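In the previous chapter we treated chains in isolation. Here, by contrast, the input contains eight separate entities that must be folded as one system, with a combined length of 505 residues.
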Amino acid sequence: MIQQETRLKVADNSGAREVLTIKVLGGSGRKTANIGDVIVCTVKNATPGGVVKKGDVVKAVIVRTKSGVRRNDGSYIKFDENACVIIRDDKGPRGTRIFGPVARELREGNFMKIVSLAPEVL
Amino acid sequence: ANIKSAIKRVKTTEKAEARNISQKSAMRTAVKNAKTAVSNNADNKNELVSLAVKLVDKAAQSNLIHSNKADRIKSQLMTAN
Amino acid sequence: PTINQLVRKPRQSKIKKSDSPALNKGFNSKKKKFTDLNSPQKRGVCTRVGTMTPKKPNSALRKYARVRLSNNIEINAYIPGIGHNLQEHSVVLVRGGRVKDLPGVRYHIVRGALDTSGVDGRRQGRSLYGTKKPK
Amino acid sequence: NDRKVYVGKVVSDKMDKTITVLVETYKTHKLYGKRVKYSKKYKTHDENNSAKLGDIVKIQETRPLSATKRFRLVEIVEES
Amino acid sequence: AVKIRLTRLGSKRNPFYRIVVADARSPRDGRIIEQIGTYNPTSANAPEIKVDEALALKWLNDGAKPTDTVHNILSKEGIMKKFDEQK
RNA sequence: UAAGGAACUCGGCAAAAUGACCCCGUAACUUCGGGAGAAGGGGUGCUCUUUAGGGUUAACGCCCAGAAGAGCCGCAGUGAAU
RNA sequence: AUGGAGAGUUUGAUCCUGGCUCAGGAUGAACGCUGGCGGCGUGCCUAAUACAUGCAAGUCGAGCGAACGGACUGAUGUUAGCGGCGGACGGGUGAGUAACACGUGGAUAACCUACCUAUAAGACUGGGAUAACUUCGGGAAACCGGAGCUAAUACCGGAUAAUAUUUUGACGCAUGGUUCAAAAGUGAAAGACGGCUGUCACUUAUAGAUGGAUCCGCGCUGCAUUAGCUAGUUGGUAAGGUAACGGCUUACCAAGGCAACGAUGCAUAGCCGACCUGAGAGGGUGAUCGGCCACACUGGAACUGAGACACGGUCCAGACUCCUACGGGAGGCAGCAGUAGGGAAUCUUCCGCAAUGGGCGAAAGCCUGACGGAGCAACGCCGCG
RNA sequence: UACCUAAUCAGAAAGCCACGGCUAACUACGUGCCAGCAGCCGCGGUAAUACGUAGGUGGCAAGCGUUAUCCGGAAUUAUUGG
C-alpha cells in the first residue's frame, strides 16, 4: 500500500538509487497503489552520472512491494522491500537493465519491456 | 578461445586432481594418526609411523609434495618417536 | 660559492616556460582528464570570427578567430593572408607562432588546410598562405 | 668464496642478541669531486651480546636472520 | 635443451649466420650462451665457414645438440669426426 | 497494531526511539580548560577445560579480580525493573 | 693538438650589467606547395578505448582400444577417443611499479631444475577399472545423467633398490665433509627390429650443462609551502610451512625499529645497453634492435604441471556485448591483418614454410601471422637521374 | 624477381623558399599607417630593395618551408667556467 511521502528503492540503472513519491495517478482522491501502478516522484539519491539526476520530477512504476498482491486463485505474492522503475512516458524504462525480481502482474499493464528486461518474473 | 588441446587439458586436469587429492588426503590422515600415536606413546606407534613414512614417500614420488617437504615430515616423525 | 656549499646545495638551473601552451596539452574524453602531448598542430572550431585592433605603434585592422581546440581550451588565432572564408562553426588547423601587435593572439590558423582556403591571388610564397600552383 | 666484512661502531644495543653497527665510509661527488662522509647502519646478530654501545666491532655478512639483520658479530676489539 | 644453432645477422636477401650455443627456448636472434663461429652461405661459390674447435668440442661433450645444418658445418671441419673418435 | 513514516500541526505538543557495563574510535571550533559520553562501530547467556593474580594465613580455607580455549541453548543473553 | 666563430636589441651619444631574439644540429614527426627512380631502414607516440571477420599451438596409429573407415587379408587415414609430450616457448603491450624493478659487483656452508649429456644399478610379480563403442533418458542450446562391454607406455597393490630420512661412533657463526653400523620406508614399459640381441621408452642414484630463486655493497626523479613515521612494527623464544633463510605466519616476551646523510607523504615514471646534442665537462631522451621486469577486459583463487597462480587454460565476483522455449548459456585482438573511435598523425583483412629457429614424431612429415618475403606511405639515409 | 644483352627516343622526369640588417640574392609597378608583413630590430601615412605582383638574383633540390620538442650558441647555475 504505497501513498505519498513513501520512499522506494529504484530497481534499475537509471541513476536514481532511491526516490520518494508525491501522487498516485489514477483518480481524484486516489490514495494508494500496488504493483502495476504509476506514481510521480522525485529522486533523492543519484549515482554520479546516470541519465536521471538528483532533484528531478519523474513518472515511475511499482514493481515489488512488501504488502504484495492477491492473485485470483488465493495465492499471494509478497516481497521484502518496496521498489520502483522509472518510465519514459511510454511504459518503457529509462535505464538499460533492471535489478531484482518483478511481479507477473506487470505483464497486464503492458509494461512488457519492464517484464522482458527482468531477472525473475513472478 | 577453446583450442582443441586446451579443451582436452581441462578433462585430464580434473581427472588428475581427483586422483591427486585422494592420495594426499590418505597421506595426511596417516601423518596425523602417526604423530598423535607418538604423543601418547600408544602400542601401535611404530607401524603407524611406518605407514606414514610409506605414504609420504609414495606421494613425493608422485610430485604431490616436493621431495624436500617429505624429509621435513619424515624427520619430524622419527625424531619425536 | 665554496665547494662545500655546492655539495650541500647543487646548482639549480632555470626552467624553460614554452610558448604556445595549448599545443602541449591533450584530452582524454573517457577519463575526463588532461594529458601532455606536444603536438605540432591542433584542430579546433571557430566560435567567433572578427577583427582586432593592433598595438599602439601600428595601425591596421587584423582578422582573428576565437578557436576552441581539440582540448577544452579556447585560444585566439591569427588568420594570415588577404581573404578568408571562415565564419562560426568552421573547423580549422592551428599552429604555433604569436602576433606581436595583437595582445592575446599566440597562434596562427594554417591556410590551405581542412576547411580553410588559401589566398586567391597568391603566386610567390604558396607554401605559406595555402593555394596551389597556378596552371 | 668469501663473504664481505665491515668494521663499524656500536650505536644501539637495546635489543637482545642484536646490535646496530654504524659503518661510516666515503662517497665522492660526481660533479664537484669532493669526498663526502656518509654512514650506513648495519643490524648484526650476536648470540652472547657482549657488545656495548660505543665499541668498534668486526661485522661479516650471513644468510637472512629476522626481517632486517644480515650480519654476525665476528670480533670485538674496543672497550670504551 | 642446449642447442648449437645459427643466428641470422644479414640484411634483406643477404643472410649472415653466427654459430652460437644457445638454449632452445631463447629467441633466434635473442639470448645466447657462447659464440662458436660464423657461417656465410652467400660468399663466392663455396659457403665460407669458420668454427672454433676447443669450445665446440666442449659443448658437445656437455650435451649440446647441433641442429641439422650446424651438423653439416661441424662435419666440413671434421668436428663431428673427432667428437666420434673420443667414444 | 498491517503498509507508509511528520503527509498531522502554528509548532514532531504528546507519544515513540537511545539508555547499563567493556573494548575500539571521535571532527570543525577554541579563551587551549574544553568541545566529548561528541559523532560512529563491536560484545555481554550458559557449561566445561585451563591458569594467571593481591587479600587476610601457620596452613587448610575464606574473600575480590584476570587471561586463553573448547563446547551448549533460545526468536532474543545488561532476555524483567531501573 | 684534430678540438671551442658570433650578431641584433635599453641611450641625445658611451661603457658596463642584464634579459629577449636569431644564425647550427636533430626527430617514430605533422602540415603547406611540389614530386622521377632504386637500395637499405622506419611506420597508432593519442583511447592498457571497444572490437565485425579470417588465421596466430599442435603432434605422436612404431604407446592403443575402436561403431572404426577403407586399398587389396585388408596399405593407408583419425573419421572420433584414451594416453605422452608440448600449450609457462615463440609473439604483443608499457597499464602498474620510485622497488634489490633495473645496471654493476658479489654471496647462497638458506636454494629448486622437465627435456639434454655421462656414469652406474636395474626394469620383478599381480590386480581392478574406464574412456571410445552400444543403448536409454533429460535439456531450447551449452551440455548432463543412467545401465552393458573394451584396451593401453592409463591406474592401483606387493617384491627388491641408493649418497633418500632417524639413531650411531670416528669452520667463516648457523658449520661443512666422508667413513661407520643399525632401523623404517621409496621404482619401472613397453613399442617397432634382427637372429639372445640392436634401437628408443622407462625407474633410481649421482655429477655436468641449462634455466630459475633468494640475499647483500654501490648507482639510480621532483617537491621540506611533505617532518616525525611504524606497531609484525623492531628484536627474541617456540611452533608451523617454504624448493629455501627470514615476522613468511601465529602465540608469548621486551620496546623496540627508521628519520635533515630527507623516515613518511604527494606527483611523475617501466629500467638498461643505447640515441640526440656539446670541443669537453655536461644537458635531454628511453621509437625500431638486444638484456631484465611487469601485465593480458577489471579484481581474487587455486588445479594440472619440472616449471603457471597461466594472452588464444579452470572457478568466482564485477562492468559490458550476444543467444534463450526465461530455466539457463557464450565471449575477451596490449598475437597477425583488419574495423569503429580519439587524434595533427602512423600501412595489406597478402604469399610461403624455399632458408633460420621452435614444438611433436624413429623419420617421412605436420603446425608455426615466429620468421623469410611481397603490398602501401619522400617518413628518413644513401645513390642515380 | 635482381642482373646482363639487342633496338628506340632527348624524347616521359623541378620545384620550394629568400633578396633591409643579422644573412647569399634588387629593380619596376600597384597600394598608401589601408591592404597587409614580421624571429628581433621593426615596415606600410602617393618616389617600401620590409606589403602584393612582374623580371632578375641567390640558397637548396625530389625535395623545399612552417609548426611542435631537445641540446648548442647561453660563461644565462660559472666543477671545468660567474
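The two ends of chain E are 22 Å apart (CA to CA). Residues 1-87 of chain E form one domain. Compare these points with the single-chain example from earlier in the chapter.
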